[PDB]
Symmetry: C3
Subunit: 188 residues, 3 copies
Amino acid sequence: KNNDKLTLWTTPDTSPNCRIDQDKDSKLTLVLTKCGSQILANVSLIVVAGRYKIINNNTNPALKGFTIKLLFDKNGVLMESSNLGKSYWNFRNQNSIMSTAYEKAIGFMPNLVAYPKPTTGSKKYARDIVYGNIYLGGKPHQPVTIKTTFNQETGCEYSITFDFSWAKTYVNVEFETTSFTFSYIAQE
Amino acid sequence: DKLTLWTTPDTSPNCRIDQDKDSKLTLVLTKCGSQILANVSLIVVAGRYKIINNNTNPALKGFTIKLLFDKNGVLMESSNLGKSYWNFRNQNSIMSTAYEKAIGFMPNLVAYPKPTTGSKKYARDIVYGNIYLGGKPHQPVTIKTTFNQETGCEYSITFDFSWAKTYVNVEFETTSFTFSYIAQE
Amino acid sequence: NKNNDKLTLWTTPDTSPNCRIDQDKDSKLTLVLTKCGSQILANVSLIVVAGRYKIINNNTNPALKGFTIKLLFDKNGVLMESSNLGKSYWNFRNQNSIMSTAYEKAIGFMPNLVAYPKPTTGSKKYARDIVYGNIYLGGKPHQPVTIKTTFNQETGCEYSITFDFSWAKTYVNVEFETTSFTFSYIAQE
């Protein structure tokens, strides 16, 4: 009706949907829009609770990054082992989601020939990585690196991994980010 | 082409930074369902921002171009960009008639809320990028894009241009930057 | 084939060399152009598999700081044989491969000539025909290379995409194989 099977997303709310350190400590806002052979991806992160909400590298000098993993089965269905919760990961309907959990999203999965699964004896190429920067609090001198890797997780058919890292000593800085856009080659 | 809202890609000035028609903002918004793919560049053709000289004007380090939209996604006259230049694509030009509705191109208000007393302002309504004056690799300028942070409108796209180098007799005409944002509908 | 995808012009996502930087088939340029109406969404990476740019050593070659890959197109948007990119696997998509026949027209994928004019002797050259990006050798965050993409600035063709790769660090025995970068450009039609 208003079902939008060309967008797979978290809904644009600020309600937590993600575990970095503890259940529901963060909102990963992730929008995957299918433009044929490419997925246009838009991502940001708000940490609402737990250890990563406020970075203080004076008190926690070793706290310099964390990972959010989306693991997908052979149908492109988000697995329970993901950091991202399944509840509100679905095809778009307006500002919400389709009324039923999707069964197939292979059109949204990172291409396995572009981005092969890890295997001994085959060369691992960097083209399964996209680097970006996002900025804590929108401040131009609070960069964090967002490294996105496709299909490098085990125990799944497809994966998107977000590795967040910083090299600056952030003192009482709320971990809530600007947005970044990237694309990747779709499986079909 | 009602999937593209743009300024035709010619060099004819369409924008007021400092004075009438001092610049060409080339802005292309392509609707890929729930996301708008945006491509932007700027040519300053006249007035105070045409040639940057930070020897003469050491405090001249940025400026803003605002697109303000009403509840129908129609560009408001208070915008820096002229309304007569902003329309759905027709070939290398624009539709001959004013659009009535472009809510599908507006930045999503739940993703990017209007400024409100008492409520948390999140940075996800910002995208940072760099563009390069004259295409020169050592003439970066920051283009900060903010969604729905202007007052007196339903929706907004704001381009804040800034630089942290002393540019001497540098023409303010930029490389292109691509970003996306979540659409209202 | 009703699996022909004339909204994707690409190299295929495989690792088979398709590009000459220094010598025949020394690299795989993975380039995917997806038509979203008036804009082409472009995704690019480079693997150098052989020849002088496979392993950078700026101790042995201190002046070696860049190279160029040119795609030159005729009036129909057909890739010219003189390009760095090889013609045989540059085609509209069919699944993970290409349409069975070489395309005759791809003007919808060409960089817009009003946005990005050809070089002319008397004419003001605007920088908006350039996009800058970074990619990272071996996926390592401290091995950046600049990828500068320029539209329609080559002579002897109707359209062009030029990739200028450069770096500003001393890379010692670093394999030139990159992360991916996404950009867009305004389409001719």
